[PDB]
């Protein structure tokens with residue numbers, strides 16, 4: 529029997545940044561027989577149009593919700609210092625490209641820190657290349673990888689997979705057992721109920 | 735995947751009687767893939783040696799501990815009304831003979847109630863016959879099965895199975911997953927920690 533937990537996220541998703549300490553603990557605690565697979569869900573298509581000011585006020589107020597409920601840190605200067613753009617695809621391509629040099633998780637964290645703490649635009653090339661350097665990547669290979677057809681192939685496969693798993697919001701977990709798929713509820717604060725749900729599913733399917 | 739939970743017990747073990755409501759709940763709650771198997775371990779070989787006063791007092795003090803810790807019921811008149819004998823192989827034969835007529839659990843409970851509640855001597859043949867009659871067994875067949883070499887064989891095989899499973903004392907639980915065996919700690923007051931131990935072990939071996 530073949531068992532996999534998909535974690536469907538976006539580097540620019542606020543709740544996923546709120547979820548970070550728990551999903552990392554979850555992945556560490558998961559039994560070794562379960563593969564863990566990240567899937568970018570692709571929160572917003574490529575675009576250069578600046579975010580209209582109502583959408584900016586909304587997203588800012590969501591950061592404050594997450595801070596209140598989860599204790600998550602945000603540098604609110606992002607809304608003052610940057611021109612926010614509703615576009616997340618480049619940041620998904622950056623994490624996948626970093627994954628080619630075995631640094632998927634290091635780049636994911638670096639983009640979340642950039643966006644939520646460092647007041648840096650997470651959709652910009654300048655940010656991605658500055659992060660690639662900081663994280664120790666071969667910057668030139670990372671830049672060629674971002675622009676190659678191999679990466680658009682991988683990226684497209686993950687966007688289709690997120691829709692195929694039935695995911696329309698982030699973060700989401702889906703557990704696969706052979707040919708069957710089971711959504712798993714996210715618990716933001718604790719790993720214990722999530723592991724219970726996973727073990728229970730596996731055992732009901734034996 | 736072949737999964738089996740062995741419960742190793744003796745009808746005349748007083749902690750097994752203290753365990754009874756929890757082990758019965760456990761057996762009801764077990765996921766359907768796990769088979770439950772009773773194994774008699776044979777606390778003490780056949781004998782007529784009278785239990786002397788110091789051991790009668792030690793065993794009665796254990797009954798009090800069990801009552802204090804678990805709320806278990808005892809009729810202490812056993813200690814005034816009977817001549818106790820530490821001899822349990824016959825009582826193990828009796829539950830196996832009742833199992834030949836699909837009444838293993840009914841005879842096990844009738845022996846516990848006879849010993850702990852009815853102040854009846856649990857090692858005496860007259861007790862076994864009386865319980866066989868009270869639970870509605872074919873009494874003639876029960877006596878033939880008790881005296882036969884067939885039952886002696888099944889009984890010796892249980893004594894060897896219990897020792898093979900690593901068990902010297904009761905109650906004990908051992909989980910078999912294919913060819914691997916895992917001791918599972920007993921929790922006298924609830925099933926939830928024990929089910930979690932079982933689920934964790936199964937997922938850790940697949």
Ligand SMILES: [Mg+2]
Pocket residue numbers: 785786789790820
């Ligand atoms: Mg004795």
